[PDB]
Design a protein around this motif. Sequence first.
Motif, PDB file in Angstrom:
ATOM      1  N   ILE A 197     -24.029  -8.533  95.850  1.00 31.17           N
ATOM      2  CA  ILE A 197     -23.145  -9.623  96.147  1.00 31.17           C
ATOM      3  C   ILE A 197     -22.242  -9.872  97.556  1.00 31.17           C
ATOM      4  O   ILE A 197     -21.830  -9.214  98.254  1.00 31.17           O
ATOM      5  CB  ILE A 197     -22.145  -8.524  95.448  1.00 31.17           C
ATOM      6  CG1 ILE A 197     -22.821  -7.903  94.038  1.00 31.17           C
ATOM      7  CG2 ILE A 197     -21.306  -9.251  94.647  1.00 31.17           C
ATOM      8  CD1 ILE A 197     -23.778  -8.731  93.313  1.00 31.17           C
ATOM      9  N   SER A 198     -22.297 -11.471  97.240  1.00 29.98           N
ATOM     10  CA  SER A 198     -21.215 -11.662  98.285  1.00 29.98           C
ATOM     11  C   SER A 198     -20.276 -13.110  98.261  1.00 29.98           C
ATOM     12  O   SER A 198     -21.075 -13.892  97.500  1.00 29.98           O
ATOM     13  CB  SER A 198     -22.255 -12.641  99.867  1.00 29.98           C
ATOM     14  OG  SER A 198     -21.580 -13.090 100.752  1.00 29.98           O
ATOM     15  N   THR A 199     -19.030 -13.128  98.547  1.00 35.75           N
ATOM     16  CA  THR A 199     -18.124 -13.824  98.232  1.00 35.75           C
ATOM     17  C   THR A 199     -17.025 -14.492  99.343  1.00 35.75           C
ATOM     18  O   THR A 199     -16.843 -13.167 100.066  1.00 35.75           O
ATOM     19  CB  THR A 199     -17.382 -13.853  96.844  1.00 35.75           C
ATOM     20  OG1 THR A 199     -15.802 -14.700  96.258  1.00 35.75           O
ATOM     21  CG2 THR A 199     -16.740 -12.023  96.979  1.00 35.75           C
ATOM     22  N   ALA A 200     -16.830 -15.838  99.505  1.00 40.66           N
ATOM     23  CA  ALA A 200     -15.792 -15.704 100.009  1.00 40.66           C
ATOM     24  C   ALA A 200     -14.518 -16.215 100.095  1.00 40.66           C
ATOM     25  O   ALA A 200     -13.514 -15.736 100.812  1.00 40.66           O
ATOM     26  CB  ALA A 200     -15.866 -17.379 100.913  1.00 40.66           C
ATOM     27  N   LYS A 201     -13.996 -15.486  99.245  1.00 41.57           N
ATOM     28  CA  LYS A 201     -13.030 -15.128  98.293  1.00 41.57           C
ATOM     29  C   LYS A 201     -12.876 -13.602  98.557  1.00 41.57           C
ATOM     30  O   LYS A 201     -11.978 -12.990  98.223  1.00 41.57           O
ATOM     31  CB  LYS A 201     -12.765 -15.216  96.631  1.00 41.57           C
ATOM     32  CG  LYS A 201     -13.072 -16.033  96.214  1.00 41.57           C
ATOM     33  CD  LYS A 201     -12.208 -17.848  96.717  1.00 41.57           C
ATOM     34  CE  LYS A 201     -12.248 -18.755  95.801  1.00 41.57           C
ATOM     35  NZ  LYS A 201     -12.226 -18.774  94.842  1.00 41.57           N
ATOM     36  N   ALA A 202     -13.659 -13.068  99.236  1.00 43.73           N
ATOM     37  CA  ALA A 202     -13.606 -11.319 100.021  1.00 43.73           C
ATOM     38  C   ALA A 202     -13.354 -11.146 101.103  1.00 43.73           C
ATOM     39  O   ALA A 202     -14.149 -12.135 101.576  1.00 43.73           O
ATOM     40  CB  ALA A 202     -14.017 -10.304  99.526  1.00 43.73           C
ATOM     41  N   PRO A 203     -12.644 -10.432 102.278  1.00 41.02           N
ATOM     42  CA  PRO A 203     -13.309 -10.891 103.670  1.00 41.02           C
ATOM     43  C   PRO A 203     -14.414 -10.631 103.771  1.00 41.02           C
ATOM     44  O   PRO A 203     -15.093  -9.859 103.293  1.00 41.02           O
ATOM     45  CB  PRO A 203     -12.504  -9.560 104.148  1.00 41.02           C
ATOM     46  CG  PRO A 203     -11.473  -9.143 102.871  1.00 41.02           C
ATOM     47  CD  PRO A 203     -11.954  -8.991 101.970  1.00 41.02           C
ATOM     48  N   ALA A 204     -14.883 -11.180 105.584  1.00 37.30           N
ATOM     49  CA  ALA A 204     -15.949 -11.419 105.521  1.00 37.30           C
ATOM     50  C   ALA A 204     -16.744  -9.992 106.127  1.00 37.30           C
ATOM     51  O   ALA A 204     -15.532  -8.953 106.898  1.00 37.30           O
ATOM     52  CB  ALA A 204     -16.138 -12.239 106.750  1.00 37.30           C
ATOM     53  N   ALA A 205     -17.335  -9.275 106.045  1.00 36.63           N
ATOM     54  CA  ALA A 205     -18.052  -7.821 106.804  1.00 36.63           C
ATOM     55  C   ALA A 205     -17.188  -8.023 108.080  1.00 36.63           C
ATOM     56  O   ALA A 205     -17.937  -9.242 109.335  1.00 36.63           O
ATOM     57  CB  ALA A 205     -19.533  -7.934 106.822  1.00 36.63           C
ATOM     58  N   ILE A 206     -17.362  -7.054 108.640  1.00 40.59           N
ATOM     59  CA  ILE A 206     -16.709  -6.786 110.673  1.00 40.59           C
ATOM     60  C   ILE A 206     -17.681  -5.933 110.615  1.00 40.59           C
ATOM     61  O   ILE A 206     -17.752  -5.071 111.862  1.00 40.59           O
ATOM     62  CB  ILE A 206     -15.161  -6.536 110.460  1.00 40.59           C
ATOM     63  CG1 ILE A 206     -15.090  -5.455 109.662  1.00 40.59           C
ATOM     64  CG2 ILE A 206     -14.477  -7.300 109.779  1.00 40.59           C
ATOM     65  CD1 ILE A 206     -13.943  -4.337 109.977  1.00 40.59           C
ATOM     66  N   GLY A 207     -19.159  -5.288 110.084  1.00 38.13           N
ATOM     67  CA  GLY A 207     -19.900  -4.732 110.433  1.00 38.13           C
ATOM     68  C   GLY A 207     -21.262  -5.166 109.705  1.00 38.13           C
ATOM     69  O   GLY A 207     -21.204  -5.641 108.533  1.00 38.13           O
ATOM     70  N   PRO A 208     -21.995  -3.955 109.721  1.00 35.66           N
ATOM     71  CA  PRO A 208     -23.519  -4.073 109.547  1.00 35.66           C
ATOM     72  C   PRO A 208     -23.599  -3.758 107.747  1.00 35.66           C
ATOM     73  O   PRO A 208     -24.231  -2.639 107.295  1.00 35.66           O
ATOM     74  CB  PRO A 208     -25.205  -3.411 110.240  1.00 35.66           C
ATOM     75  CG  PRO A 208     -23.891  -2.428 110.651  1.00 35.66           C
ATOM     76  CD  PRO A 208     -22.004  -2.843 110.599  1.00 35.66           C
ATOM     77  N   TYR A 209     -22.682  -4.234 107.025  1.00 30.18           N
ATOM     78  CA  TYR A 209     -22.816  -3.817 105.695  1.00 30.18           C
ATOM     79  C   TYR A 209     -22.519  -4.945 104.759  1.00 30.18           C
ATOM     80  O   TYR A 209     -22.243  -6.488 104.959  1.00 30.18           O
ATOM     81  CB  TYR A 209     -22.141  -2.815 105.057  1.00 30.18           C
ATOM     82  CG  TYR A 209     -20.721  -3.239 105.817  1.00 30.18           C
ATOM     83  CD1 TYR A 209     -19.215  -3.973 104.907  1.00 30.18           C
ATOM     84  CD2 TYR A 209     -19.638  -3.077 106.774  1.00 30.18           C
ATOM     85  CE1 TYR A 209     -18.509  -4.304 105.060  1.00 30.18           C
ATOM     86  CE2 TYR A 209     -18.985  -3.606 107.392  1.00 30.18           C
ATOM     87  CZ  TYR A 209     -18.026  -4.088 106.219  1.00 30.18           C
ATOM     88  OH  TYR A 209     -16.774  -4.553 106.430  1.00 30.18           O
ATOM     89  N   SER A 210     -23.029  -4.782 103.782  1.00 29.42           N
ATOM     90  CA  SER A 210     -23.124  -6.138 102.258  1.00 29.42           C
ATOM     91  C   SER A 210     -21.389  -5.864 101.083  1.00 29.42           C
ATOM     92  O   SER A 210     -21.243  -4.262 101.099  1.00 29.42           O
ATOM     93  CB  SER A 210     -23.842  -6.296 101.505  1.00 29.42           C
ATOM     94  OG  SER A 210     -25.236  -5.982 101.805  1.00 29.42           O
TER      95      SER A 210
END
Lengths: 136, 136, 136, 135, 135, 135
Positions: F9-22
């Motif tokens: 699950i990935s949406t630009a409406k939530a913050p981008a990852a700041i580490g190796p995680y989804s």
Amino acid sequence: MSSLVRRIISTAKAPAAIGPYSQAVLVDRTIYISGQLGMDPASGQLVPGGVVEEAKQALTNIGEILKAAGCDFTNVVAATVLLADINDFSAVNDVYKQYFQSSFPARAAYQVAALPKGGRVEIEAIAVQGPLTTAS
Amino acid sequence: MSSLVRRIISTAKAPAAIGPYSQAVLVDRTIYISGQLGMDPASGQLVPGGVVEEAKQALTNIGEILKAAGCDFTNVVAATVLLADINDFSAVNDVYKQYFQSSFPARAAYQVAALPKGGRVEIEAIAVQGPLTTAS
Amino acid sequence: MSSLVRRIISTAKAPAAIGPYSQAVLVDRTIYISGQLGMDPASGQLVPGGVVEEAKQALTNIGEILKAAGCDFTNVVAATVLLADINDFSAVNDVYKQYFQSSFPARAAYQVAALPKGGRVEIEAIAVQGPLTTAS
Amino acid sequence: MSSLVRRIISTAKAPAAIGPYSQAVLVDRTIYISGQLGMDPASGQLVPGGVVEEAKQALTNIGEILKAAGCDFTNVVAATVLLADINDFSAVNDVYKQYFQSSFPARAAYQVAALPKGGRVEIEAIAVQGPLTTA
Amino acid sequence: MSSLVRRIISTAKAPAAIGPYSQAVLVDRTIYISGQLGMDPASGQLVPGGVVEEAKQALTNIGEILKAAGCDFTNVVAATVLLADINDFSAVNDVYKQYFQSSFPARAAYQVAALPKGGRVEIEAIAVQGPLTTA
Amino acid sequence: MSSLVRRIISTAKAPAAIGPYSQAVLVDRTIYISGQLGMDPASGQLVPGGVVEEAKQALTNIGEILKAAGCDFTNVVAATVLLADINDFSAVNDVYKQYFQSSFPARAAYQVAALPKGGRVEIEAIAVQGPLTTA
Ligand code: NA
Ligand code: NA
Ligand code: NA
Ligand code: NA
Ligand code: NA
Ligand code: NA
């Protein structure tokens, strides 16, 4: 217990199911398809020309019910071919083979005493909604 | 949606399914087995001796298809016994009872107008891949 | 793999299944019901009066097997109506329609050469244990 | 209801239990993996070298537990990284990235007050036995 | 898709909620159990006697929640033991062992900075409703 | 065995990852959501105003991740509230209550030693994709 999905399948591209039955019933992932005769959807009667023409129409009818359920012939897992004359098996089988390419359904074929509408062939099928990972 | 397993069952220990069908199809946990006649796998024709001999061969054929699917007769949940003569039911049933001990499949038995190959008996079955916890 | 439930259905309110079969088998969520004739549970023989009376008794028998499995006629997803005479279809269908109101099962109906016990009608069914969410 | 598979996962390629827990439990198709410290499997002692070496060993241990359950790191769907020191975040992230090369699991990572045995890092995981579908 | 069972588990044999949470949620066959402190169910107050008594009460509370969902401790597949003091590890392990007698769950156990109400221990769990298969 | 759905699950409406995680992983029907800080989705920085504003933003972020997976807050079955300061418990509870209006999830809430970026609160969740049955 979980509530499993049941969907009633209805399409105008196949003979209407009048009375207390449905063209097909999808329940969980399995689709039970009512036996189809070589009936023309718009005439309400058998197509002319005999068992080969009826077999083509019957399978066209099954195909339209499958499409309405989001499937095609690759989803069929079992079928029954009912005949008015066992000696028509080879001719019907030459039509049937045109609808399947591989991973063929289980099948039974035999002669009954009479089909509705004076039909010479009737085909029943069971399908499973995809996706399906076919092993062998 | 999840991708359900479909396996095509093929064994040399049962008559080969030539043409557009398979000996059996396993899909999810359910195995649809094509109707079996009293056909010898190596002769391509009915075994001699009549309906009792044919019934033994038909059930031997079903047993070999089950084995190829990792099952035995305890996995069968429904069967159909098709006869050329209703009066052969008792004799066929005395063979059939040798293959099942308890928790018997659902069953239908009746006479059809004709079976392929001049057969006098044909048996269809549905099985479910184990393990199965049998309640009652 | 998970161990799926299998339940053997037995009720005194329907003709007893003597020999190597069961009135019905529930496996996972699917109930395979043995073909029912117009047999009286207490007489061991056909009810009198012909195909309409037999059809009522056959469906009463199916209803009692469903009840024993925790279901009713709304759980039926597929049925087969076997006839001794295709011309009895309309009369049997007028009985059948009394047991279903909507979301009708898939169905096949045809004439066989002979049924057990001299029966004029036999009904087979497949049901799915609820709850079921019926879409359309 | 059906009887679901429940299996205790145990391999001598990962450290023996130092308390009343299993290395992992498989139930249906979900595998709950116990928190792994950077302990050497043969000796049960924390490897020397601090948080970087302990993180490598902890993830190696998770890998052997996954292998015992017929899985690899691509089956991991969620993980938790417990740190003794939040300043080790970047260093642990760089180690962690080398094991999880694709379909990165969901994750939570933060500093706790203390870990067993004085560990500098402990990693928990949840995996799902395959096959899994692809994008 | 099918409609999966979701049920709020609630029993007066476990402490009332002191915030916006349910005691446990059953979804499909998995039961997520909220963190339990060593609170007395009738009064909602932490039992006296320190970490050992609080751990017994917390696990007793989990047991009553499991019972309400038709389960017992053998249905637990994963647990988390949150400590106010890592030096209590051995003492809590000895209590914990008495409740989980077989098929030990996966587990993580470590010290956090503070628990609600000044608790010395809080225990979370995940269970799967039976039947489950055996080895 | 069947191939189960696994989706990042990935949406630009939530913050981008700041580490190796989804942001979250959907597997079968369960959605594991990564820990969310009160970071603004467009900038990736913690919102000003302290724990109350950060908690609102963290829960808003969870909501957008749920929406991307075809869910809302009623699909959440379990959550974890990690605090930098246990004295913020009542304030965070009042924010949290406004998002979870019914079928309250199971929950654990406690203070850790430190959160990434100096966050005052981080919230993790587990959801199950609908439909779900009702009481
Ligand atoms: Na055939
Ligand atoms: Na003709
Ligand atoms: Na029978
Ligand atoms: Na003969
Ligand atoms: Na019909
Ligand atoms: Na008659």
